[PDB]
Amino acid sequence: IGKVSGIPEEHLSRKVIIYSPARTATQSGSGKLGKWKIN
Amino acid sequence: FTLNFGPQHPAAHGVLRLVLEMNGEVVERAEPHIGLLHRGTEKLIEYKTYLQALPYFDRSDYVSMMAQEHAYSLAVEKLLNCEVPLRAQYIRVLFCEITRILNHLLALTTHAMDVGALTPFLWAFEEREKLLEFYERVSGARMHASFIRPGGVAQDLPLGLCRDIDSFTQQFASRIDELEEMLTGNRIWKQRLVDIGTVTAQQAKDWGFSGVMLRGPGVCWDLRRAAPYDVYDQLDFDVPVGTRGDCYDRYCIRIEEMRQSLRIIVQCLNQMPSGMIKADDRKLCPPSRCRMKLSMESSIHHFELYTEGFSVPASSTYTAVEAPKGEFGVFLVSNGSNRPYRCKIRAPGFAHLQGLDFMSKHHMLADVVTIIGTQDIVFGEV
Amino acid sequence: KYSWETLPKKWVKKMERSEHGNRFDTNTDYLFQLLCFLKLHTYTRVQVLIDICGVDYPSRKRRFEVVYNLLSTRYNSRIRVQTSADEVTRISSVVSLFPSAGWWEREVWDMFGVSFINHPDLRRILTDYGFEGHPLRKDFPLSGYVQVRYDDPEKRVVSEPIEMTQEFRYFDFASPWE
Amino acid sequence: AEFVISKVDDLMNWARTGSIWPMTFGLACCAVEMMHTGAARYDLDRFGIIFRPSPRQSDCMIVAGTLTNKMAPALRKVYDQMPEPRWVISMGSCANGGGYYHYSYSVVRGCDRIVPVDIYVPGCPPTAEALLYGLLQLQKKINRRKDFLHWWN
Amino acid sequence: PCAHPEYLEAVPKATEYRLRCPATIDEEAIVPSSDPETVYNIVYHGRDQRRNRPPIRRYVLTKDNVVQMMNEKKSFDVSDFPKVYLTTVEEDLDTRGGGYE
Amino acid sequence: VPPNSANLTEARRRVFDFFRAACRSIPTIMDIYNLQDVVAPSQLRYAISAQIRNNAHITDPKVIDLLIFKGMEELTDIVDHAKQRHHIIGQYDFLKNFYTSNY
Amino acid sequence: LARKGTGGRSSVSGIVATVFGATGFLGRYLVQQLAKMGSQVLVPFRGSEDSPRHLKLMGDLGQVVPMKFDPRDEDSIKAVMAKANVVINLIGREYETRNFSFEDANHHIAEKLALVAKEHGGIMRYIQVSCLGASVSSPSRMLRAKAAAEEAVLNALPEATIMRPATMIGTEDRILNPWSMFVKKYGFLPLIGGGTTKFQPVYVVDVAAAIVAALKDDGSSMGKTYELGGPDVFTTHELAEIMYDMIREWPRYVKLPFPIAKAMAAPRDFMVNKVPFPLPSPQIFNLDQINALTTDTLVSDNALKFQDLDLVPHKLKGYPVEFLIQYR
Amino acid sequence: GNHTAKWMQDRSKKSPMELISEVPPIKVDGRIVACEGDTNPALGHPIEFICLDLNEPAICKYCGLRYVQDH
Amino acid sequence: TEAMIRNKPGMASVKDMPLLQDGPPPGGFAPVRYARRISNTGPSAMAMFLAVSGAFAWGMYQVGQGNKIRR
Amino acid sequence: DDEEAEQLAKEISKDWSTVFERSMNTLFLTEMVRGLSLTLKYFFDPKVTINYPFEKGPLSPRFRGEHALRRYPTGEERCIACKLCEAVCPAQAITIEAEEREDGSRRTTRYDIDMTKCIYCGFCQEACPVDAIVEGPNFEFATETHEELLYDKEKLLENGDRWETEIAENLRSESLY
Amino acid sequence: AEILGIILPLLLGVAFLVLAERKVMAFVQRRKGPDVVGSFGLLQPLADGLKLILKEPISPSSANFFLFRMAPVATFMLSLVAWAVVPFDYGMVLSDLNIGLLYLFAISSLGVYGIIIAGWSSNSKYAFLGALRSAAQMVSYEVSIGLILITVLICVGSCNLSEIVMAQKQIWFGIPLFPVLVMFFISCLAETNRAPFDLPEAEAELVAGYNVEYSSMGFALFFLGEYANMILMSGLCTLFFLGGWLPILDLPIFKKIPGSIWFSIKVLFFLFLYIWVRAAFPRYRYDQLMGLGWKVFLPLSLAWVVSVSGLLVTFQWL
């Protein structure tokens, strides 16, 4: 489903990192955790 | 025989790029080409907060600006449950209706300039430059008045705006009469419009016309009588509904809808309650400049409402108002976050311009500009 | 609601809501059959396909969600039949029932990529002519992949090279505590 | 002396600044504001500006609105068939620079990517007077031409 | 002999209109922000609208439930049917108010 | 067109159908866009075949259906004067990278 | 150079060029190369501000800064080359104009830009552009001047590349576009000297691609006079054969002996005499272009060719001549 | 200054830093001041209450104005 | 706040706040016309035909008498 | 049906001295002479036009035109770098970089509004806490070249000092809202 | 000769008619027309001209110079030569032809050639069919103008235009045959294109409806031709029907009665009527237009020849 998605070829050999953004250390609040994001 | 009928008069119908498959002078099919004005509006709104999303709506339909901000606001109050005051509703209608007038004044006489009548255009545009003295006075920008915010409305009318809107409404029945005496009686008009683009009601329903092209055919369907979304359930006005469906009925409606809109303006003027301008819920309405500077808790909200946003709860609603073009509805899926999530904009002119294919079959090539006239096709919404 | 009693239970397969406009999240196979119902029915007469809103949920398994809005000019009500079809699932087209669905489904395929079954003239309506990629998806970057267009020695021609612009500044306004 | 050349340039520039008929690429609302700048209040037929409906005979081209990536080839093809003493005015933020849609995939980041521009009317919905002042600046750009003095090098 | 029945005498040229230019503060507007009852009583959870809503109750129906409901629905008597939005057209020239609103 | 691809067999059949369509349409392609002198019919057939073979390892039938649909879209927009021609003519080791950039 | 980017059109290449002849047929391709690989271009124009307007695009918001300058007045050339590290020189004429003579437009300028760039220490690469076969004792005074220009730009400024492009073909060129619009004299093409001339044209895009390739190169291509010849050594008649393939016309040539031509181009050579009127830029019949047309020295000898730039030129059939379709 | 040498290249109009460092500190009575802005509490910055316990003038962060105890 | 922004010296209570904003004057505006008052007080069907036909009868008699004078 | 509809719509006007009325209003073009008469009335009436450069259209103190960074009466740029306008901007025109100046009070080293990439919606004027950024009623700043139209970091938006005499007036009259 | 004294003032008349139309049709729309160029836009025509002259061509194309570079010359020469027989005052016609009227009819029959040729040399199928439609319109309202002139001819003795304007000393043929003036004006509107009758002249379809190689000279010459044809066909509604150069004959003490000034006043009235009627009325679509020249202005013109022939034969008024 990479080829049908119209994305150019050079951007399907990309190396991503599927992390989960840690909590912003400055504010002690977990309302932005558990939202996994491709990086 | 294919003909690439483009914009006959630019600056009136901007990117109109029909590809007519003709038969001599009789058109056999009209294939409109869309995308020449396809700005990334249904994508760009997913990337900005619910406040930053509002200016796109005045830029969706460029001849009837505030009607779309009013359709968006009512889609971020359908979710927010954000009860707005009475004055916000009355101003919001007094400007949605001034916008109906601003649109019919254009979409009649730009149509009447495509047909050939050159003067109604300039008279109606003097009228529109009187109504933009109200837009520009109440918000700031003559066209894109990002004024009907989600909670209520941006800021109160100036202390001399109802007097001026009255001094305009008194002299506006005469302008409609002139636009009417110059076009309604003419045998060169009727001939150019009667039995042009006749839409049987089953066709106007099938093709989702839902506008002044659904009340031509005779379907009594106005979303101000069907789904009263403001003081409209209090305001008295008769929805003119055609009996033949030809482009001469839609013109007669748009020239009566421009009088009932005058009735609604005069009512909104005569009964405008001195109440608060925005919803008291200061977590949906940024507090005034005076309050946020003096109050610490208001300053925090002015900061988290002009940077973060509302974060309207998770839902998905289709709020549709009666914009001048038609039933302009904004289907607003909302992820819980402060940014919308696929703010799909059902815009008439995407359903109307579909109708061009069957409206202008067997009509002469010179009628294909009259059809585009009475559909009020504004390509920002398409 | 009357519409849920008469409707065959199988047709409203997955979901059903009861506020903010009622919806029948159905299955893609029973969709045009469900759209055949609610129209050409005496007590449910919609006749008016207002809108076909593609909605893309990347975290689902059936990514897209083709939200068919429907107005009922007769009974003055509005029902939102939905579906769910991923990038490679051809979904039934309702241009045969409501002929307004033609352009709306062209736009749903253009923006998203939800091809429509037996839809005549299913061709990219909104995006550019040589457009590759489906914009209103989520994984499609805002600025587009190759979508700058400038004039050049290939006179009278605007090329379509890879894109470069002031970086769109994404602001992480979202605050904790929801 | 050179004075005769100075006056023949003044005359050519007075002509090209008096009658400057633009092919108004009125895409979007800035075409509605341009229509107000062509309307009764701010006359453009006063300053000689006659909105031509064809690119064939037009001194200018007031591109307005969002130049879409699909209306880029059409704008270029129209600009290529204007007679050489042509100018282009960008009206509105979407037409002059990227604008509200700078980061939209389908919107070119300003017509300055397709046609060479000579006066950018500023303000996303420019006041009708602002487009009128942009044209009164294009008139200055004409009055600074002196094409005869340059033909004599 | 035209559209001038002593009523076009409301002419477009006003000549006395916006007599008080906008940025001239003859009267200082007030534009109330909050209702008087909600100035010194800032309890919010009662006034809240964003978050003061019943939670989504998404409960599953299995085959047993719907066959029970289909058997319970014995008959579709009138008033179990959606009412029609009745709207007829009726000719009217200027009778609403007498042409004066 | 309904996805009769309940198996790779029907999908491959319609792949061959699209291939025959593009091949038998190459005449109009060469005519409308004037490649009958720069490119040979052997070369355009070669390019169409290299396209259909470059994406031959698709064990998914619906993905093949969608690929054939994108191809038919491309063709129909090449047959008619919808897209231009200067792309159709274009459509038809570590150290040497290191010297240029860091990526 | 100090390149911080990926491709161009917003990248940087550390090349703040001043393409002296940018408002010209070669200039629009060279400026587009330099400003599509993402580098500033300080296009200096001579007269009407409409000259470099077609260059305000093809460069991203100040990557192309058209500037005004007088050719004979320095302290303005120094102002154009104030913030610059590359200075290409495309200032050349094929016809004498009453104000600027052949030397004052081909040699006495290139030497002047060379000197005022030498003074402005910091011009890393100074490319000097002159026609191929522009060696002294060439008949055409344009080539003798362009040879003196090379000799004075190398002397006054060593390690200064010197391209030697032969007649360049392309849109808005001075070689094919005069022949067409003279085929509009009813297919009548007056190939002079009988087409015995042997000259190697070159697609102007490839001349530009070579002029930029000597910038992106290393310390080499400095002081080395290339010869941007091109492929398919042609003859004037044979080149005309390819035009008639693009423009749908029937070959109807005639031969003109050189005395007949030089007599037909004897007018428009009183340029210094007819003071109160400038002549209309002799397009096809140019006594000096004819003196060059006589001897077929316009062929690349064993001097440096495109091969010494990792570059191979395009042909002259197909697209690199498809600008003629606009004449059909 | 040096910060002001990043956005201002005029260098003839006095730099805002100097325009505010040359205005005298304002005497007051208590230990806390308002500095609502220029004069009009709605045309100035959010009111910033400054402490004057120290001997040196305590600047208002938003407006640069300086206040001293004036005991 | 909101009692320090709308002062109204006195007022003893949070109600009775100034509240002076735009609106219709006491008694509303004048009754605004919206109907189509197109006066049809022109020459009727007759009087226009009889003015035309009177001319193509007396004026044609005058053409005849002028032809007699010219002859 | 259209045949019968025509027969009946022509048998509605079928009584003498009504056929005559319609015949004398379609022969002596009478609907059209009411068009010509109105057109003449407007040919002779005063003209709603404005000889622009000398007199300009009416505006309001809320009018949104050229953005101007305000200053406090005692110099000192009003723009503390909160970045609220950079955040609220729908088109992301404003690029703000902040640095603690030597005085110690925060200020923007870079405050560049890109006017071309700007929608003139006045969100920056609302979002700014101290009224640091306001739209001056200028609206007459058409620039020959695009690079000038990108308003530099706090230097050209600092030309609002010239417009302060009008901006301070508009703010003193709008602050009531 | 003295043909300069009738072509140069007519050239100035056309150049100032472009301004008179823009300005009158603007005043109608509540707006001053061209008003900055000259003291009152009086130099605006010279500005339009001197601009069109200084505009570089889009393509030289001087090769095809005998086909369509003399066809606008032909149209314009015809529009200008039909001015010879038009008399401005007693003994001010350049050439009193005793068959003057029929000569005007022939000049129109050659203007048909002008249009057809100048449209055929434009190798644009849409533009050529547009030129053919415009020629068929100009020639279908020529049978109606023919019969209208047969009416005004029956009233007069001879075709001599000086006689047709001398035959109105008693009463202008505008007063008895007013219904005919309305038909001649509504035909002269339709014979020329500039009218409620100009679908081929619909703003866009006109420019792309006469030629492909503009070079400016073609654009100006067509418009100079249309505006001279208009001054002419308005100088016919004032010879035939209005008194060519005749006063109302009240013989005032304030008025010394110049002839050419009266002809000028009347042709100004009809030019102002051309403008006014362009402003206030929608276009006719060329499919109702051709069905108005045959089904409306031919029957109502034939009737008039039989009415003005009958009523003048019974009572011996001939």
Ligand SMILES: NC(=O)C1=CN([C@@H]2O[C@H](COP(=O)(O)OP(=O)(O)OC[C@H]3O[C@@H](n4cnc5c(N)ncnc54)[C@H](OP(=O)(O)O)[C@@H]3O)[C@@H](O)[C@H]2O)C=CC1
């Ligand atoms: N054209 C050809 O076929 C060939 C040309 N060349 C060489 O390539 C270079 C560029 O070619 P091309 O662009 O076609 O040449 P052009 O003759 O078109 O001139 C190109 C540039 O030279 C400038 N220029 C010429 N003479 C003067 C002068 N006296 N003072 C100031 N500027 C001057 C022009 O300024 P402006 O536009 O204002 O006049 C323009 O910017 C020249 O050195 C030319 O001889 C090489 C091979 C053959």
Ligand code: SF4
């Ligand atoms: S720049 Fe603004 S006003 Fe102009 S077209 Fe774009 S959105 Fe509309």
Ligand code: SF4
């Ligand atoms: S008005 Fe202000 S906030 Fe809105 S886009 Fe322009 S600069 Fe940004």
Ligand code: SF4
């Ligand atoms: S202009 Fe306003 S929002 Fe922007 S940094 Fe300054 S104070 Fe903050």
Ligand SMILES: [Zn+2]
């Ligand atoms: Zn302070």
